[model samples]
Target chain A: MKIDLNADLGEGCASDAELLTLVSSANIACGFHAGDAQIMQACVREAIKNGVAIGAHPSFPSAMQLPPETVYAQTLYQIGALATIARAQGGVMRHVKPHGMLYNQAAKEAQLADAIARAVYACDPALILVGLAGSELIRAGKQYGLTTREEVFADRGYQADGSLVPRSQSGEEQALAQTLEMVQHGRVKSITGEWATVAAQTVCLHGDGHALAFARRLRSAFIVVAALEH
Target chain B: MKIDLNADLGEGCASDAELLTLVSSANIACGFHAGDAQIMQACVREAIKNGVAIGAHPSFPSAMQLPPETVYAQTLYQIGALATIARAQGGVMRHVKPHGMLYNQAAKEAQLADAIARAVYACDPALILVGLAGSELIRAGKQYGLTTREEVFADRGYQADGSLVPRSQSGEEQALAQTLEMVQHGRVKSITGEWATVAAQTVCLHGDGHALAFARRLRSAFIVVAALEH
Candidate 1:
């Protein structure tokens, strides 16, 4: 079975080149929550060189400072920004993934999800919209006639209802094993001690944690790492 | 008989629509110094709607912390970000104008000017580079084979050497008359009472502190207000 592996980069969080070598797709930050223009261009170049799919990763304009209309505009602004750099480097942006609070808010809020979807569709309909699995964002993308990718986290725990377990968990020692079981069996045992159906077209290995080690281990675990075919 | 009247926008200092109606061009902040993604897109749309020429106004990433390499990268990233937004809105960016300390540094630093010029040329060769009149930035733009516009301030005083008079020397209450005289005769009497040659293709009306009143007065003074010819 083939699976797309993606990682967040260009946030000034970690070494992008090192992460690029391991991931099949890159979700590049576009100067909202973190990344800048130079980082965006460099990340795009690295992604292209590695034959990795490039995606725009936009976030809220600020933490609770901007309204929904402004948030929607911010999303489009970021997508355009990254897409331009990607095109300049001879690489086309393949997807857009909202970051941080924007991502979480869009997943649950139908209005915000529609706003993000509208912004993405307005900028370029060919760009795939990536969102949480079974989220309002995914539904919004489909409603807007754009291809949507349901993404699950490799290092995050899921609930019985498929929502991610909050990051306040005690430890990350078991995350790797849980990811393996989910990839292998299409199911994951939730924190509630109930099995949850977990399947995804793309798996996100966050750049913040032990992502490199996780990627290395996943590669050795008989999973075919690649980008989703458009 | 035409002069490009411009103002710095997207800084959240004032309503852009009111300023867009007055200026022939806008130097939009590109998320490094002040603006965000939502502000960028809104400013671009307003500029297009008002038939105003849009220019990217980027600044140093930090106050005085980042190195030259980081500064160069920030400049490229900002230009790409703003340029992409402009294109996405069915408008093309007409120029790039460095903001704040970046603008001042590029005026004197040859290496920094070269970096700015290289970034502009790398993104688009046709983009007009706006810089301080007779400064290193204009020289670098010329060397890079990009069209360069000499820019002067309407509200600031100039010295005999074409450098701006230090702002600490009391009031610019007579700046309105001085600006008219300069536009009419291409010369102004400096604080030292020596006449200085001051001519520019573009005159910047600062957005803060009586900018609106100044633009109104300049308009009634029969000066042709228009954007620079592409």
Candidate 2:
């Protein structure tokens, strides 16, 4: 099976063009937390040009903090806002992912996740909800009977409960080895260091601040995997 | 000594309509920050009909965060972006104010304030800069030779050093008596509860929560003061 590699794209990041070239999916930040209309339009153009599946990355109101850790509105408002923006973009979106802070909150906050799922369902149930495999957000998407993509991090370790260990739990560098192993094996080690069942159809590589050699290494591995699968 | 009372007009605050009637200046949040093209045009018409001076409140790269505090180039791009929007609304913008996190960041960070001021000067030096009285933003505007208004808060407290004591500071309440004393005497009490000199060329009462009684009382005091001066 072909696995997709997604990257967070288009937040005035200089590497957006490069990441767009490498990734199969692009999570574009909407104006709320990260980007503006111009940025969104430009990113959409890039995604379309590259044939990358475009997704909306909505987050909390905080812009300075980068990764928003708070929800700016009630469930309906957030969901409605996403749907409105996605529709406004002329429905080019193929998926939705709660960015940073909202990502964490939605995993445990059923109401918020359900609202997000409802938004995707209303907008287009064909749009996938991309989240950590076995996350509350994933469950909500399934409950809504919408297409869901259980996203797995190539650079984060999984918990015993099969949830990805939050970046807050361990600094970003702490899981580099396990993350690389998963990128190689398409599976992750659990918090207990046992292999977790990660049936991830897609893997995420945080393209922001990524070293070039690492990407080249990942590319080499992907090429090998593609050849084997074919 | 004429002091103008400004409120954020239009943009769907339940009180914007009422507040506009009570204030001398109405700094409309341009599409970059809050209000949209339709709301902006309507607000401009209303403010003009009511004989109130209109100004642009341009925030940051994201929706409401002005100056964005981190993304300098994006912030530069947005200043031009909002100016385009404002110009489209019948050349209505007479002045400009940075908003929210960006507003506060400009108050303290001179370099950031200067950059923003320079862009504003380039955009329309004739456009006045609405800045907190006795702060870095005010100084930056002055340095750029742009007309600067000394803006005092209605419900917010001040700092000992002339900068705004951040909202994070404790004891943020404003007693009605203390507010009247400031408006009447043109003095603001700092967080230390010590009297600090402030020239109230204009004052702002937020339209979100304390708008009703606050606008009424503040306007009442201003009218009373005007009659005394006349």
Candidate 3:
């Protein structure tokens, strides 16, 4: 079965080398919630070196506080920031994925999500929009003529309605084995332990201050599966 | 008369001292048409030091094309940039004024003007909306519960309907005496020699490199009037 293994990279988690080699696609962060100019440029060079498809990963405005409340900027900032990085990096950017609150907001809020879709459409009618499975963001992206990808989280538990249970909810685990198990099997247990089908073109592994060793485990899994066939 | 003497500032013009001391209010450019963080901070410091009110002079994303074609992202970028600067300064931006092509757009494009007004109101209700006199901008601004300022020109000639004659039509050669007379008498002879009321709270002068001396001339005329009153 042909599948696209994507990892959020160039965030400087110190695991980019391993993850870059492992993933077929890399969603690079644009400078908003995270990733500065230098980081973006470096990411571009690394992605090119690895021959991975590069995409712009834009986050909501609450960069100062990346938690429950992100100060959301207009779609303009997200699209513009990403477009600037994409253009600077020899126009290699092929897609976009809103980070953190942006992802959640687009899933639930139609108007807010539509603005972002319009932004992507305006920037380039061809750029893909990657978002959570069964989210309004996916709907908006398709509506705005963006090539859409339904993103799935390997480690994260979901609710009955196909949305991830908020981390604030109890029973959020950080075990790599559990995450890998979830990744291998498309069925991630719901908060209620019921089997939920979550097919995705892309799977996100957040590469923040932590998660470096986890990335290595993920890479080892890829090498064993030969799904990456490098 | 407690009229606000507003002058556009910060948009790459190096004449902050001359403009700061001359006007009661300053419309500081945000990072769309011209200014950057350093420029905004410097302008803010100057305005506060000189007791001049500070406003956000946002523009279309046309610094490259000075009076560019209207685009939705262009409008969104300017609004976000302006709002961020205003928030960063720890002062509620007192006003919102569209610059360059935006000004001309508001004169004819009703929907685009209202969209700008909606974005501004969504950002801050207290912020005033400065627009060309008797144009759709003023109407839209008022509709959005924003204080609308009828912006006027110090160097341009007017038409019968309170609109300025296109500079291309009348070759920008109204005598300096006639301009001063208009400032004093509150009535100006139009390019067609018809009398029109020069009614406005803020008189604008383009202060790019070549327009600095012209701005100085208008400022000098205003100063002369105040000195005569004293």
Candidate 4:
């Protein structure tokens, strides 16, 4: 009855200390979409100081994007970067979590998933690779002989097939109650009003402007607020 | 009787392998002004393959610009990122070099130099710190108990005090013959018609389109093609 609560840190949108107090794990930015070394180091140190598990959150190096080959290598490079910072802080990274487009794409893109898994394996075999629940990334992680965590999003809407609803469509915020229900009951009500299975070991909360309050709410809703200790 | 031939790699503006073959040390971009994880990993592996020393080239995380405080933090984060990739590839990063405006700013700003030095020391104490010859960054590196490399540029003109002439004056390329003389004789002819000392352990070749030919010429002139192999 335990779930690892996590938020993206080092994005410069939230104070790491405040977020650290509320979340069990941190998906630290690995200098792709956002965050610099200063933010990453401070976040890593803050995560250590507050006893939060650290995970690398890599994304397409830019919003413009590149091919899967670039994504794979970049993801690997990013994981190593975050891991180095964690080690310097006398802490160890517990997971590799893709961010934004990388996360969404890996859910269905087999080749991308394989590249990411390989990157993680190359960096450290013991690291837990995290991806969308029941996605290609999870499958790839398993195939690569790494522990995989199925992650659910508390802020994003889902489709009947358990894939996240496209962000272009509105009504995402309206689906939060449903997402919370899914987190609690393992059943997600998709945008089309169909239910889907969502067995998740961890849940992601957006860290922009509202994560602290939302994390607090989610923590209250789910009694299991434990760090990804393993 | 030795000088390390170095160039900025992973900028995506130059062929890394081609540059690796020519240079003895590579100052790799750590995802700030240029280079992503893919580029960084590829560059690190290429550097190792070519027996080139790997160095982290850090810069301000934002092209939009940031304060020195942000610059300091970003530099630290960038170093950790590159070091992680180097370690994953079974090689070690041997140096730290600030890039672009971060590099220029660190030359005169004592606080900024100290911040960059602290960041480098925090990542690894043994790593060499490269800065403009006779600049505050070199001083800070010494103060932090790290070995320092005095870097002189082949393409830029020097001032009487060993500072670089501002790029706007536009006669730097014309002063190439004199710059070469400085490299050979340890005496730089300042733009203002004065001669200054220019003792350097490493020389920087820009990695833009024109660097290859210039590097070739510089190589033939300086006979010391070794890397900063410490």
Candidate 5:
């Protein structure tokens, strides 16, 4: 199956160097919650050197308590700053994926999703937006005339409803096996043994812990984001 | 004499609407210290409606004491956020000016000035960089090959060394008369007897208090930024 293997790097991960070697896409943190400019610069350079696609990993501080306007500006700010760094390093920023909490909220909440999508489109319509498979963020990105990628997490267990089972225990074998099924079958077996629809144009692997070894084993190809007929 | 009247707006300013009418340029706050996406949108729209140039008023958190790298990221973040808002409103983001202490410190420090200038240049080389006349920021903007505007105060006194007289006092007649000389002659008599060479391509009028009247009285032309050679 044509799928992209992506990881959240530049979030103070020790395995970033190794992960860069394995992943097809690297979502560098944009200094809101975690990474700073130095980390972002390094991540972009490494991603460029490895010929891996780069993207922005922005987050929310208020858990959607902040206004959508704030989220829009914050998201755009993060994307713009990262884009600048990427430009400096001769790398193109591929996509923008809101950090975990922002992603989860935007997946269900259309307003928040629209805010982020609007931000990305305003900065550059060419940018691809990565969001939870079948999520509001993907919907918003489509509405904004942006390329949208339905992102599936290879390192997390999922609920019956297709949402992740927040920070739960994820086994290496289960993650690898499940992700293979996710990319190949466009679905995953929920922890509850129910089949959850998660069309995976892109798969997000964790950068910390044993993710490096898993990524090394999962060698993959970046599906042309344009081919995904959202 | 050719000069542009600009003011800091969208910083929880009650007089933004009034100020937009009076000024030639509106430096909308980019929501770090005050304001939000809504306010920025409103400011940009108002500035567009009023036929005023729009710019980003990015700040340090206090976006400065942080590393130059952080400053670069934060400043670019602010600029990108404001630029997005400006784009949605059909307003072009014409310039960038660091806010408060960020502006003050960068005025003297080459490192901070270069950081801000680099961020602005990376975002858009065509964007103008406004800073204290003859300060390090102006120097860096020139180095970056950006259109540099030597900004002088229309509502403050000047030190003998050409820096602003920090919050000590300002008088209406003195401010207006001195600004006129600043624009027409490129110099102002310091609080002391010495004359300070404060070049005035753009005059920063305050949004609060009597700035509206000051702007109204100081009707002027936008000097072709290209005419000023470094």
Candidate 6:
């Protein structure tokens, strides 16, 4: 029942306040695809103020442009930007989780994953890396000698292989039930009507509307509350 | 004369090979304006092999835009980009020197200067901050408790205030002779016919056509030789 709750924020999120109250980790967007210094600085302050872990959510400025294409610098640039901002505000940056297309690609591609992992390690080896559970990015993070979090999405449907069912699928929703199953039993019922093993050390709250209500509902669960109380 | 000799490279410099041979320091471009991870990596490799110091030469993506506009993140992004690249290659990132308009603006503007210095110190407090001698950037660097370097340009004319005379003036070029005067006595004869006291800890090689020749000529002078010899 116990899991580190996390979410992406500071990128024009409508639920930053309530979301912060519920999540243990907040990944603020670095200036690239979205967010800036002031936004990042304020997010950092709030994370520290709420006793939540602050992390960098860096995204590629361009789509389909790989690190071999210019991303190593792009990735490091984004992290260092937030890292300094957080340090300036007396906040500790705890992890990195790539966003959008960069995340999807790094989840499968070894090179992009390694490029990102190397950038994170060099910025500060102590920073954790959050990635899709069983993903290439998590593998690369481990290869780079960094601690990592195998993150699972609460709202997304999972495939039998433990990967997300593509958003286009609109698969059947049993999100809260699935999240608890993965958290408590280390397993999930995939959209395909079969069981799948999943590492659920952390759960990601999506950018979807009603994310706050989902968190409130989650907190209302006796299992979730007991997980938190202990 | 026991000063650190530096040049900018990885920005399509024609003399990358020869420049690494003669200099004790280098400022590699970090891909915002020019240069990528591979270029930065190779430059780091050369610096480590040649016993030259490695540094970051970060610039703004746009002109006339203040960092309060986007630069605190922008500056940290560029340095972290290069810092990781250098660390990947086992090269120590020694310092940061802003490139182009960012340099000119930071040299005089306290906020921009502090933004740049704060980025540098956050990346690593041990990394040096390089700026035009006596410029506000130097002041900010000292304020951040960072080891600082007052950098002088080799092929530029100086004003009575020790700032460079505008290139629009096309002032007289004593290039080598003034370099010696600056290195030997910590003073330069301003192009406006006055003496300006300057700090001469490190010198930047310009992007001029005969910049290599200027270094060759500088090394040819007995005072310059004794400075290096000592």
**TM-score, every prediction:** 0.82, 0.47, 0.49, 0.77, 0.83, 0.84
> Where is model 1 chain A poorest over a 10-residue stretch in terms of lDDT?
A60-69
Q: Model 3's DockQ?
A: 0.03
The lDDT values for all models are 0.81, 0.63, 0.64, 0.80, 0.79, 0.78
Candidate 4 is graded, for docking, as acceptable
DockQ of each two-chain model = 0.35, 0.02, 0.03, 0.38, 0.34, 0.31
- Residue pairs clashing in model 3 are none
TM-scores of chain A across candidates: 0.91, 0.78, 0.76, 0.88, 0.87, 0.91
Pick the winner on lDDT between candidates 1 and 5. Answer: 1
Chain B TM-score in each of the candidates: 0.91, 0.80, 0.77, 0.89, 0.88, 0.90
- Ordered by lDDT, highest first, the candidates read 1, 4, 5, 6, 3, 2
Question: Which regions of candidate 2 are displaced past 4 Å?
Answer: A62-91, A168-187, A223-230, B1-10, B13-230
Model 6: per-residue lDDT, tens digit, B171-227? 434777888788889999887899999998887765436657767667666243211
Q: In candidate 4, which residue pairs clash?
A: A37-B77, A38-B73, A74-B38
Best by TM-score: 6
Candidate 3 lDDT, B70-170, residue by residue in tens: 33334434444444444444544577788878778777778778767775665556777888887888889889778777777766768976688887785
Off by over 4 Å in 3: A1-175, A178-230, B62-76, B170-186, B209-230
lDDT of 1 by residue, B124-221 (tens): 88899999987999999999899998887776777888778667874654767777777777787777778888667788886576557777777777
**Tens-digit lDDT track for model 1 on A69-157?**
77677677788777767776668899998998889889988988998898888778898999998899999999999999888877677
For TM-score, candidate 2 versus 5, the one ahead is 5
RMSD of each: 4.2, 13.6, 15.2, 5.1, 4.7, 4.1
- Strongest candidate by lDDT: 1
lDDT of 5 at A10: 81
- On residues A1-230, what C-alpha lDDT tens digit does candidate 5 reach at each position? 46777888888856788777766788888877788666888788888888888899999753427688878877876777688678865668878889978988899899999999998888788888989888899899999889998888776888788877766464446777887788777788988999988778887777677546666666642233222323
Task: Give the least accurate 10-residue stretch of model 2 chain B, judged by summed lDDT.
Answer: B221-230
Model 4: per-residue Cα lDDT over A97-206, one tens digit each: 99888888788889889989988887889999999898999999999899988888776778898878767784534435765676578888787999889877888776
Give the candidates in order of DockQ, highest first: 4, 1, 5, 6, 3, 2
